């Protein structure tokens, strides 16, 4: 089952919702992630260039797919097949971002 | 500001998240809508053919936009410019639906 994260569009994209699978994958409870930028999932072995591509895509409200090394709450590394897309109204205003997170470590 | 509604993909698409604007537009608090299908927003004068188009789009996980007559908690009618899109993982599985609700009254 794939994780889903919803963030606000503006002001450093704080998490506003995660599904159950997000907790299964990351080991974080909703309480522990709400109001935070998802970048806490990253650590020392996370690829800087991949993070840069995410940063620029989100700034431009551009859909992006990346395979990124993330870390469970307990510090265990896992490979995150991450898909982020802006949510737009019909006037093109960005209302939110949605992230789909799949553990592809195996 | 535009409302946003997130539902589960399966089992009659219960609401799992709404943003602030959803409450401003509909007059419903999150606690009142969570776990419910969004069809409660429809009323007597809602166009049946529009509802049928939404029903078929969701069944096939197809993106759809409709202008649909909805009703606030207090019963006042409003025109809802509604856009629904499936949220998919990289293997095409539908993880959720996202609806954007703009009051165009
Ligand atoms: C909806 C959403 C979900 C995200 N999910 C993840 C994730 O699961 N793992 C991750 O490393 N980064 C994720 N990010 C990316 C970070 O929040 C951040 O945008 C990224 O690290 C680049 O920005 P920064 O250089 O300011 O940290 C997500 C971003 C958004 C908007
Ligand atoms: C994410 C999402 C948001 C929705 N938002 C609305 C809405 O704001 N107003 C509305 O009348 N129907 C909305 N619907 C549609 C109803 O939930 C339902 O799909 C529609 O009435 C057709 O199915 P039915 O014939 O089983 O009711 C939404 C559906 C989804 C999946």
Author numbering:
A (entry chain A): 48 to 153
B (entry chain B): 48 to 152
Publication passage describing the model:
Flavin-binding fluorescent proteins (FbFPs), engineered from prokaryotic and eukaryotic light, oxygen, voltage (LOV) photoreceptors, are promising fluorescent reporter proteins. Using spectroscopy, X-ray crystallography, and quantum mechanics molecular mechanics calculations, we provide a firm structural and functional understanding of spectral tuning in FbFPs.
To rule out that the I52T mutation alone is sufficient to generate the observed red-shift, we introduced the I52T mutation in parental CagFbFP (light red solid line). The latter is corroborated by the X-ray structure of CagFbFP-I52T, which is virtually identical to parental CagFbFP (C-α atom RMSD 0.52 Å, 102 aligned residues).
